[PDB]
Amino acid sequence: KRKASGPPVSELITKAVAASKERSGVSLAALKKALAAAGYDVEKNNSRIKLGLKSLVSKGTLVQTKGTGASGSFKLNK
DNA sequence: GCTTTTTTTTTTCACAATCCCGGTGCCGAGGCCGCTCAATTGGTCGTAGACAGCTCTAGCACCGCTTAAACGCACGTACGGAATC
Numbered sequence: 561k562r563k564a565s566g567p568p569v570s571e572l573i574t575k576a577v578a579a580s581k582e583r584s585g586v587s588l589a590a591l592k593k594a595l596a597a598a599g600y601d602v603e604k605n606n607s608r609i610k611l612g613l614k615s616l617v618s619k620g621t622l623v624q625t626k627g628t629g630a631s632g633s634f635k636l637n638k
Numbered sequence: 639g640c641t642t643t644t645t646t647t648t649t650t651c652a653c654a655a656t657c658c659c660g661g662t663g664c665c666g667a668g669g670c671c672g673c674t675c676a677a678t679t680g681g682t683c684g685t686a687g688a689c690a691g692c693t694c695t696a697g698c699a700c701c702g703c704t705t706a707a708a709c710g711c712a713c714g715t716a717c718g719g720a721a722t723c
């Protein structure tokens with residue numbers, strides 16, 4: 561009955577947190593802190609989270625509404 | 639071995655759709671009536687085909703050559719289908 565709680569951590573989650581936010585939103589900075597809130601402070605995972613972007617359009621998971629140079633305002637169904 | 643972490647999975651909860659009930663009423667299944675016309679009865683008359691008795695067609699069995707076709711193997715090319723995009 562204590563503090564730590566958070567995510568399931570991959571493309572099951574990049575699709576779940578982007579959908580677990582009630583509405584649309586920007587960048588690596590929104591998605592990672594929702595994914596690292598439990599206590600696992602970000603170390604080497606920084607390249608691993610970063611990679612997910614081409615992996616999502618190539619495998620067809622999130623369309624990006626906004627964003628250019630490692631920024632991406634990712635969408636699901638409206 | 640042991641973390642660091644995919645995927646896989648399971649769990650959970652919310653939503654939508656379909657499933658099952660009783661209530662209601664409307665109408666066509668069902669059955670009855672009376673009359674009709676088509677099935678039955680009891681009659682005759684002729685021929686369709688059953689049957690015996692015959693013929694002799696063609697279906698079956700057999701036999702021995704001469705191939706042409708079938709069989710098996712060696713080899714490798716291009717096709718099927720699996721994986722990714």
Ligand SMILES: [Ca+2]
Nearest residue numbers: 678679680681
């Ligand atoms: Ca008769």
